[PDB]
Enzyme design. Structure first.
Site, PDB file in Angstrom:
ATOM      1  N   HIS A   4       0.776  -1.242   0.000  1.00  0.00           N
ATOM      2  CA  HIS A   4       0.000   0.000   0.000  1.00  0.00           C
ATOM      3  C   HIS A   4       0.802   1.285   0.000  1.00  0.00           C
ATOM      4  O   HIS A   4       0.220   2.356   0.112  1.00  0.00           O
ATOM      5  CB  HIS A   4      -0.916   0.063   1.207  1.00  0.00           C
ATOM      6  CG  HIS A   4      -2.047  -0.904   1.161  1.00  0.00           C
ATOM      7  ND1 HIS A   4      -3.237  -0.628   0.521  1.00  0.00           N
ATOM      8  CD2 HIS A   4      -2.179  -2.145   1.688  1.00  0.00           C
ATOM      9  CE1 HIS A   4      -4.058  -1.655   0.661  1.00  0.00           C
ATOM     10  NE2 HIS A   4      -3.439  -2.588   1.365  1.00  0.00           N
ATOM     11  N   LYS A  11      -8.525  14.512   4.027  1.00  0.00           N
ATOM     12  CA  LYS A  11      -7.687  13.315   4.063  1.00  0.00           C
ATOM     13  C   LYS A  11      -6.763  13.532   5.275  1.00  0.00           C
ATOM     14  O   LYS A  11      -6.777  14.604   5.864  1.00  0.00           O
ATOM     15  CB  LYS A  11      -6.875  13.201   2.757  1.00  0.00           C
ATOM     16  CG  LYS A  11      -6.064  14.450   2.420  1.00  0.00           C
ATOM     17  CD  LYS A  11      -5.490  14.456   0.998  1.00  0.00           C
ATOM     18  CE  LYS A  11      -6.598  14.485  -0.060  1.00  0.00           C
ATOM     19  NZ  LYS A  11      -6.566  13.284  -0.964  1.00  0.00           N
ATOM     20  N   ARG A  12      -6.002  12.519   5.665  1.00  0.00           N
ATOM     21  CA  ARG A  12      -5.093  12.659   6.793  1.00  0.00           C
ATOM     22  C   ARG A  12      -4.032  13.732   6.489  1.00  0.00           C
ATOM     23  O   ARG A  12      -3.532  13.824   5.355  1.00  0.00           O
ATOM     24  CB  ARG A  12      -4.424  11.308   7.085  1.00  0.00           C
ATOM     25  CG  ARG A  12      -5.374  10.282   7.735  1.00  0.00           C
ATOM     26  CD  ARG A  12      -5.830  10.761   9.129  1.00  0.00           C
ATOM     27  NE  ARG A  12      -4.733  10.806  10.107  1.00  0.00           N
ATOM     28  CZ  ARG A  12      -4.344   9.775  10.867  1.00  0.00           C
ATOM     29  NH1 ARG A  12      -4.966   8.613  10.773  1.00  0.00           N
ATOM     30  NH2 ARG A  12      -3.313   9.899  11.709  1.00  0.00           N
ATOM     31  N   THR A  56      -8.416   6.977  -2.514  1.00  0.00           N
ATOM     32  CA  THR A  56      -9.768   6.484  -2.685  1.00  0.00           C
ATOM     33  C   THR A  56     -10.721   7.655  -2.484  1.00  0.00           C
ATOM     34  O   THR A  56     -11.858   7.651  -2.999  1.00  0.00           O
ATOM     35  CB  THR A  56     -10.114   5.296  -1.715  1.00  0.00           C
ATOM     36  OG1 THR A  56      -9.787   5.640  -0.368  1.00  0.00           O
ATOM     37  CG2 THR A  56      -9.325   4.040  -2.116  1.00  0.00           C
ATOM     38  N   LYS A  69     -14.347   8.868  -4.430  1.00  0.00           N
ATOM     39  CA  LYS A  69     -15.624   9.189  -3.811  1.00  0.00           C
ATOM     40  C   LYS A  69     -16.127  10.506  -4.384  1.00  0.00           C
ATOM     41  O   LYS A  69     -17.304  10.628  -4.756  1.00  0.00           O
ATOM     42  CB  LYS A  69     -15.460   9.279  -2.284  1.00  0.00           C
ATOM     43  CG  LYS A  69     -15.013   7.971  -1.653  1.00  0.00           C
ATOM     44  CD  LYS A  69     -14.506   8.138  -0.213  1.00  0.00           C
ATOM     45  CE  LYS A  69     -13.766   6.874   0.238  1.00  0.00           C
ATOM     46  NZ  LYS A  69     -13.106   7.167   1.479  1.00  0.00           N
ATOM     47  N   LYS A 118       0.804  14.784   1.150  1.00  0.00           N
ATOM     48  CA  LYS A 118      -0.522  15.040   0.587  1.00  0.00           C
ATOM     49  C   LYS A 118      -0.666  16.535   0.335  1.00  0.00           C
ATOM     50  O   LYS A 118      -1.596  16.986  -0.342  1.00  0.00           O
ATOM     51  CB  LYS A 118      -1.615  14.529   1.531  1.00  0.00           C
ATOM     52  CG  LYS A 118      -1.728  12.995   1.575  1.00  0.00           C
ATOM     53  CD  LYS A 118      -2.738  12.556   2.639  1.00  0.00           C
ATOM     54  CE  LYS A 118      -2.817  11.040   2.794  1.00  0.00           C
ATOM     55  NZ  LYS A 118      -3.505  10.358   1.657  1.00  0.00           N
TER      56      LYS A 118
HETATM   57  C1  LIG Z   1     -11.893   7.577   2.048  1.00  0.00           C
HETATM   58  C2  LIG Z   1     -11.435   8.058   3.251  1.00  0.00           C
HETATM   59  C3  LIG Z   1     -10.069   8.288   3.413  1.00  0.00           C
HETATM   60  C4  LIG Z   1      -9.009   8.137   2.205  1.00  0.00           C
HETATM   61  O1  LIG Z   1      -8.784   9.464   1.714  1.00  0.00           O
HETATM   62  P1  LIG Z   1      -7.583   9.824   0.663  1.00  0.00           P
HETATM   63  O2  LIG Z   1      -7.893  11.251   0.271  1.00  0.00           O
HETATM   64  O3  LIG Z   1      -7.817   8.829  -0.440  1.00  0.00           O
HETATM   65  O4  LIG Z   1      -6.320   9.704   1.442  1.00  0.00           O
HETATM   66  C5  LIG Z   1      -9.609   8.717   4.612  1.00  0.00           C
HETATM   67  N1  LIG Z   1     -10.466   8.927   5.643  1.00  0.00           N
HETATM   68  C6  LIG Z   1     -11.822   8.710   5.491  1.00  0.00           C
HETATM   69  C7  LIG Z   1     -12.705   8.999   6.662  1.00  0.00           C
HETATM   70  C8  LIG Z   1     -12.315   8.277   4.297  1.00  0.00           C
HETATM   71  O5  LIG Z   1     -13.687   8.026   4.145  1.00  0.00           O
HETATM   72  C1  LIG Z   2       0.026   2.346   4.354  1.00  0.00           C
HETATM   73  C2  LIG Z   2      -1.240   3.035   3.870  1.00  0.00           C
HETATM   74  O1  LIG Z   2      -2.086   3.396   4.710  1.00  0.00           O
HETATM   75  N1  LIG Z   2      -1.372   3.232   2.504  1.00  0.00           N
HETATM   76  C3  LIG Z   2      -2.552   3.917   1.906  1.00  0.00           C
HETATM   77  O2  LIG Z   2      -3.413   2.887   1.379  1.00  0.00           O
HETATM   78  C4  LIG Z   2      -4.596   3.296   0.670  1.00  0.00           C
HETATM   79  C5  LIG Z   2      -5.415   2.030   0.362  1.00  0.00           C
HETATM   80  O3  LIG Z   2      -4.739   1.201  -0.593  1.00  0.00           O
HETATM   81  C6  LIG Z   2      -4.149   4.062  -0.619  1.00  0.00           C
HETATM   82  O4  LIG Z   2      -5.306   4.474  -1.396  1.00  0.00           O
HETATM   83  C7  LIG Z   2      -3.252   5.289  -0.234  1.00  0.00           C
HETATM   84  O5  LIG Z   2      -2.715   5.880  -1.425  1.00  0.00           O
HETATM   85  C8  LIG Z   2      -2.085   4.888   0.758  1.00  0.00           C
HETATM   86  O6  LIG Z   2      -1.469   6.059   1.308  1.00  0.00           O
END
Ligand SMILES: *Cc1c(COP(=O)(O)O)cnc(C)c1O
Ligand SMILES: CC(=O)N[C@@H]1O[C@H](CO)[C@@H](O)[C@H](O)[C@H]1O
Ligand SMILES: O=C(N[C@@H](Cc1ccccc1)C(=O)N1CC(C(=O)O)C1)c1cc2cc(Cl)ccc2[nH]1
Ligand SMILES: O=C(N[C@@H](Cc1ccccc1)C(=O)N1CC(C(=O)O)C1)c1cc2cc(Cl)ccc2[nH]1
Ligand SMILES: *Cc1c(COP(=O)(O)O)cnc(C)c1O
Ligand SMILES: CC(=O)N[C@@H]1O[C@H](CO)[C@@H](O)[C@H](O)[C@H]1O
Ligand SMILES: Cn1c(=O)c2c(ncn2C)n(C)c1=O
Ligand SMILES: Cn1c(=O)c2c(ncn2C)n(C)c1=O
Ligand SMILES: Cn1c(=O)c2c(ncn2C)n(C)c1=O
Ligand SMILES: Cn1c(=O)c2c(ncn2C)n(C)c1=O
Lengths: 791, 790
Positions: B337, B528-529, B636, B640, B534
């Site tokens: 990942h 996102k985190r 992901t 969404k 990012k």
């Molecule tokens: C989908 C989702 C994420 C993944 O977000 P990315 O922008 O793809 O890093 C993280 N936190 C929550 C609560 C989500 O629903």
């Molecule tokens: C170690 C870890 O949390 N990796 C995370 O995994 C998600 C699910 O595959 C990816 O979409 C994302 O790019 C990545 O930062």
């Protein structure tokens, strides 16, 4: 209600509640399905009962206790609800064994012994009497430890009673409350403030308390501690706040001043008082009527802090003036003393209290100041009277005498048996009763005849009902009608048959749990209670060895065979009690394996004695051992359970044994040994243990066997600690009652040889046990202390 | 029918909650409804599991330390076809079903993308009718609840089980003992692991309803319990129970704490034992095991599963090593990942030796046979051995968990084409060279139930209106939406749905935050985190940039925006915490400058988590996916947003690249350096100052930050960011600044043209079909687990 609908509910719960079908369901699943099926029957009445108390607003009774030794709930619920026969039938039709399902349930062992079990019997009685009563305590994650015996010694294991879930409790999240600890006091111009405190949340869990056949379902509210609101470490540290309601202190009649125990006491008290005040303010009934709507019974001094806490709330928070607050407080609280043994007195050092509860220390000092000001005004020249009546003992490192705090803050103080209440009033608290004669009372203990007769001994309950109807269940005094059958031969055989069946069923239990083979023909001699030097199972052990030697000396002599059973848990840190247990298992080993004694005598150390096991062994007993040193057992309740179930009693004139003798006629009990005044005489003169050892040849042989390794060959000096205590530090004079005890024991075997005479005495014991129903005890509390009325 | 649902509700309120209508709390009503719905799962849960035992299809086990499930009530009603009836029944009882739904706590047992992917996979596997099981840990506390105090993040314990979880079912009869510490003894009866400390594992099953198909699978989470001075000894039981106490709050970051190692072995040990036990009862010795079992390793966190399976086969089942090793590889598949160094798991051998002595021996053994092979193939390439070893002697020896997962698995996959390629040809070149066929790609996906039907009912309905409901189970069906490209009425309807979502979310924002929302503004969102890679820092640079522009020329025509940035920072991630404070500071100035007014509003969305994502995503117009090219393995959130009617501004990174392939690169606002340009700059050397010097708008922004324009009471507050930005920015924030801002200007341009904007939105929605997790799962089933939809 009926069989068809009970089976239908059972299947419904097995399906939707346990997510199982008949081929994958476990025994535990079946127990849970039945439990939920029974529990559903409590809801309607639980809701109506509590609604009723809000509507008609009768005065409420709050029993505040750190312990509630409840045992199992399934059977007790089916019985009090009149559902047992129907459920038995339904479960049978489903091809299941209801007995097996019942054994799956864990005891709610939130108590150590007599004190905690009394609280449980009181709840059953108050609900059966229709009183608006509430039990308030702590929901320990772990109750009294499970006892195992390894290589003859007691081993403790965690009592994880909630691991699989407790269907009998109902979380009440909307009533959670914050409790405060530590911090500091600030005396501002808006009132003294307690600040910078650490907060621990209190989450209440309600458990229904069904009255016997009456539509009343009361509540037992137990509080659980929760934390409020490096990151990981901080999250893990939440365990610290939660440790407060984690484990029950395993001590019976012994004070241990650990800070965590002090936290538990304040925790229950603080959460309880706040909840009570809140319910009071919602009664749509300022605080002037409080004592007319509330009564709080302090079960021993454990919840003593309730007094300064109530003052703190009235003063610091409700801004009532001190004098008014103090008046309301005394009218609210009543205190029950449960013991006179020094090692059991609660004396908290002021430093610990000052650190944990700064504001309560100030309030206690204030209470003490007004208190002594009064005495000074009454006996200006008696300077030592002040020292004796103070709530503070400067005798070294200052400490708070909690019993004294309970006395000054309560309008009534009571002992638990006449002999005890008298000692409390005229000796231990002479200075106080002298001032307030009318404050001290007696309320002889009692046991509930539902759990301790209808539930545990259906055979006897049925036999009795056969002869005198069922009125006795709610009016145990009705058992005196049994006197009409004294010369009734057929009835006496029927009585003996019931005891025989109980013995047979219990013997099966013994043979599967223990290696031993039980002579079902033998007299079941039983001593079950917490292991204590004052309860003297050591004396019992001396007699056992004595009978052993007799069989060895003259094997062909006519002898009534016995099965001697001794059981009970030792507090983890009680070394002597642990040695005594090892002494008993050692003795049993020799006895049970000596080919010469064979089936003449069998000895069993009953492991893990607790409420559910007491319900099994008591109905199977012939001889009940109640041999505490005269003046040491405040009351006792096991003595009463045995009396109600057809056993005769061998004991000292101590606690309630004295009243069992008054009711049944002293000659119908095997009383023996020194009495309260004889014990004092020996103390005055000075007890010289060696003299009895010297003068009694049978005693000397027993002692020598113990001390030389007869019972511990692989380690000759093993029992040295006992020998030394027995000869130089036996505060309970084991040797001094030895001779009379053994003579008395011989008389028992004599009577046992005469079945008709034995059962005739048994009948007189049962017919006279009515005074010991907890229903009678509660009526007395309601009338003379809480001022509430049965409904 | 409605009547029976009302009757069950009242029945549960009464017997289950012990309440009546005048004393029942809101929480009581939520629980009554939950039990009412839960009852509908039972029959099918029992049949489904019975069916797997009867027909014995090959089972799939998804082993993960995380399952970011969110709330269950609505998801269950929908997948069961009960939502309308329950809505009606609750309405008739005079209750507000929305209020009841907000009572439920999220099951936040995940950090972000990795944990949420596991949750989407469960929903898809159940909807596809696969005999699949999720296996993880039942943490007492999930991802912490985030609060903002004086502009900073504050963490609070996520006590999600405090009031009870009606969605879990304890399975006490399947409790198992797990071992720790102890020592190894090599006897003549086989090596024995002894004197170990034992911790019990209690499994809790949570039902996983497939979408409209009678399938109800299981998610089994383990909880740690202690086995069996007295008081202290009882209190110390807390130590064994601390293992499943808290989810480590780190996203894409390795932290070698012993407790984390205990958690990993805990899940693995309990899981493998349970699997073997279920295998032995299948009335199907271990030769058929890989034909009945597939275990997917979600990242390297459960890497220990490999040596543990070997330990069971060898030490316990007495199978010969070669046979055991063969079965093992056929059983496991590994999913990579991430490529970020700070996220690689490298456990020091000393810690492993102490906690898991036998596993260290097994790992050394695996490594020996491994290298013996390479030595036999490339006798002269000595450094190849060093590079392919499971052990890094590079200082204090440590175990490269990724390498262990590769040698112990028959398939290894990345989560997006660009990522899978990097993993195969760069990071694990030595391994893929040897076993070309071992490496694959499985582009991530999101479940269209939770992320469309549930979170955006307005859109789901509009779409169904036009093309039927087949799209729910075959998202590729969204391409049919292309028939409406010139359909003006439809384009207004589409915009209306977005407007309603924005209106409803604006209500939320105004009540939670002091700010007043211009509902007319473009919702620019980055959730996102918080990470340096990012780059919400870049987003923040652009925000200040727009601020200065409004200040310089207030009367200029400007498309108004509501800029939203949200996400949690790992507790020990200092830079992320500084970045959050920088954003809240900037927002303070912007939201209160009378000159900007309703032209621009900035909001730091607190406590971003699954249930909040379901609210803010449907209300978004512009989706920020700006990670440095090559840093986001897949992403992901990007998917969404695409599914819900937002346009994307982002770099050619992770799955953004595939969103472009599907929708047409011109229908996304792509910008910045690409993977190869980033490498060029690295080779040449990144000199941050050059951009600061050459870009006047950038320089002003930076100076404002560094001089205290946004932190007057403390001028040097953001010094750590400045220094990182100029001398240690591994993610080249300055190097994509110019293109990013230009790109942003183009977005506002398009927004000014509603018809053109919604025309592009339509092309994004109509092309989002590839990103359904149902498609992703089909690919795993066919090319890795070898199982079939049913
Ligand atoms: C989908 C989702 C994420 C993944 O977000 P990315 O922008 O793809 O890093 C993280 N936190 C929550 C609560 C989500 O629903
Ligand atoms: C170690 C870890 O949390 N990796 C995370 O995994 C998600 C699910 O595959 C990816 O979409 C994302 O790019 C990545 O930062
Ligand atoms: O917890 C459920 N039933 C309960 C039933 C129960 C309730 C109270 C005491 C004992 C048993 C359950 O099995 N337990 C609560 C105990 C605990 O907290 O450890 C164990 C349950 C039923 C169900 C049905 C579906 Cl479809 C999904 C999830 C489910 N959980
Ligand atoms: O706990 C009961 N119902 C349960 C019902 C429940 C179960 C699972 C999730 C939410 C609610 C209950 O209220 N809770 C379990 C939760 C916890 O673990 O704290 C809260 C219950 C019903 C009942 C009925 C009678 Cl008569 C006596 C005792 C009873 N307990
Ligand atoms: C009744 C009872 C006691 C008290 O017994 P005494 O002999 O009165 O000390 C102690 N433990 C249990 C389990 C009991 O039921
Ligand atoms: C401190 C304590 O446990 N006291 C116990 O209380 C019970 C209940 O009153 C008495 O029967 C018993 O004799 C006494 O030892
Ligand atoms: C009753 N009792 C105890 O319960 C005890 C003890 N010492 C430790 N404990 C726990 N002693 C001396 C004692 O008499
Ligand atoms: C378990 N145990 C004890 O509990 C014990 C003891 N000696 C004294 N005590 C209390 N010995 C030797 C022992 O094995
Ligand atoms: C002043 N300050 C900081 O400097 C800080 C912080 N959290 C992280 N940092 C660096 N918080 C909450 C804070 O008040
Ligand atoms: C992503 N991340 C973290 O999550 C982190 C960290 N330092 C501590 N933590 C928790 N660093 C440097 C980091 O890049």
């Amino acid at each position: 209600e009926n069989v068809a609908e009970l089976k239908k509910s059972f299947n419904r719960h097995l399906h939707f509640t346990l997510v199982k079908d008949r081929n994958v369901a476990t025994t535990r699943d079946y127990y849970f399905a039945l439990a939920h099926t029974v529990r559903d029957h409590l809801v309607g009445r639980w809701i109506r009962t509590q609604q009723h108390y809000y509507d008609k607003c009768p005065k409420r009774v709050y029993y505040l206790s750190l312990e509630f030794y409840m045992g199992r709930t399934l059977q007790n619920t089916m019985i009090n609800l009149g559902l047992q026969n129907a459920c038995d039938e339904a479960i049978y039709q489903l091809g299941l064994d209801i007995e097996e399902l019942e054994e799956i349930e864990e005891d709610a062992g939130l108590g150590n012994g007599g004190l905690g079990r009394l609280a449980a019997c009181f709840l059953d009685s108050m609900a059966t009497l229709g009183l608006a009563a509430y039990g308030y305590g702590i929901r320990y994650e772990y109750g009294i430890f499970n006892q195992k015996i390894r290589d003859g010694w007691q081993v403790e294991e965690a009592d994880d009673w909630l691991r699989y879930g407790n269907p009998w409790e109902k979380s009440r999240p909307e009533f959670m409350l914050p409790v405060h600890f530590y911090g500091k006091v600030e005396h501002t111009n808006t009132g003294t403030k307690w600040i910078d405190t650490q907060v621990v949340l209190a989450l209440p869990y309600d458990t229904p308390v069904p009255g016997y056949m009456n539509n009343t379902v009361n509540t037992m509210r137990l509080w659980s501690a929760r934390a409020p609101n490096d990151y990981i470490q901080a999250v893990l540290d939440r365990n610290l706040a939660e440790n407060i309601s984690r484990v029950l202190y395993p001590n019976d009649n012994f004070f241990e001043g650990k800070e965590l125990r002090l936290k538990q006491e304040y925790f229950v008290v603080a959460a309880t008082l706040q909840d009570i005040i809140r319910r009071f303010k919602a009664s749509k009934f300022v605080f002037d009527a409080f004592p007319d709507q509330v009564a709080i019974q302090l079960n021993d001094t454990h919840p003593a802090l309730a007094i300064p806490e109530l003052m703190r709330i009235f003063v610091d928070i409700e801004k009532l003036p001190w004098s008014k607050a103090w008046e309301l407080t005394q009218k609210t609280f009543a205190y029950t003393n449960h013991t006179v043994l020094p090692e059991a007195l609660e004396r908290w050092p002021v430093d610990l209290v000052e650190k944990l509860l700064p504001r309560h220390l100030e309030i206690i000092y204030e209470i003490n100041q007004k208190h002594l000001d009064r005495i000074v005004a009454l006996f200006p020249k008696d300077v030592d009277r002040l020292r004796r009546m103070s709530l503070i003992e400067e005798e070294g490192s200052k400490r708070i005498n909690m019993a004294h705090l309970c006395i000054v803050g309560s309008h009534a103080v009571n002992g638990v048996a006449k002999i005890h209440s008298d000692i409390v009033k005229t000796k231990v608290f002479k200075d106080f009763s002298e001032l307030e004669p009318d404050k001290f009372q007696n309320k002889t203990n009692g046991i509930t005849p539902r759990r301790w007769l209808l539930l545990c001994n259906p055979g006897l309950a049925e036999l009795i009902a056969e002869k005198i109807g069922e009125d006795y269940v709610k009016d145990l005094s009705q058992l005196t009608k049994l006197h009409s059958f004294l010369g009734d031969d057929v009835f006496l055989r029927e009585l003996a048959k019931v005891k025989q069946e109980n013995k047979l069923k219990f013997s099966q239990f013994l043979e599967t749990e223990y290696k031993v083979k039980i002579n079902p023909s033998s007299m079941f001699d039983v001593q079950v209670k917490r292991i204590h030097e004052y309860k003297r199972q050591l004396l019992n052990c001396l007699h056992v060895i004595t009978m052993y030697n007799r069989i060895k000396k003259d094997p062909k002599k006519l002898f009534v065979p016995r099965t001697v059973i001794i059981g009970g848990k030792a507090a983890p840190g009680y070394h002597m009690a642990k040695m005594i247990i090892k002494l008993i298992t050692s003795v049993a080993d020799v006895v049970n394996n000596d080919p010469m004694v064979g089936s003449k005598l069998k000895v069993i150390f009953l492991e893990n004695y607790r409420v559910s096991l007491a319900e099994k062994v008591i109905p199977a007993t012939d001889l009940s051992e109640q041999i505490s040193t005269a003046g040491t057992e405040a009351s006792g309740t096991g003595n009463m359970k045995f009396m109600l179930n057809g056993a005769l009693t061998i004991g000292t004139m101590d606690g309630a044994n004295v009243e069992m003798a008054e009711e049944a006629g002293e000659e119908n009990l095997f009383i023996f040994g020194m009495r309260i005044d004889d014990v004092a005489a020996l103390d005055k003169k000075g007890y010289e243990a060696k003299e009895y050892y010297e003068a009694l040849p049978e005693l000397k042989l027993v002692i020598d066997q113990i001390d030389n390794g007869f019972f511990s060959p692989k380690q000759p000096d093993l029992f040295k600690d006992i020998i030394n205590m027995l000869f130089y530090h036996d505060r309970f004079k084991v040797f001094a009652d030895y001779e009379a005890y053994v003579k008395c024991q011989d008389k028992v075997s004599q009577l046992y040889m005469n079945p008709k005479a034995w059962n005739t005495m048994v009948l007189k014991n049962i017919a006279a046990s009515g005074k010991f129903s907890s229903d009678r005890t509660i009526k007395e509390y309601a009338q003379n202390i809480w001022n509430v009325e049965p409904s």
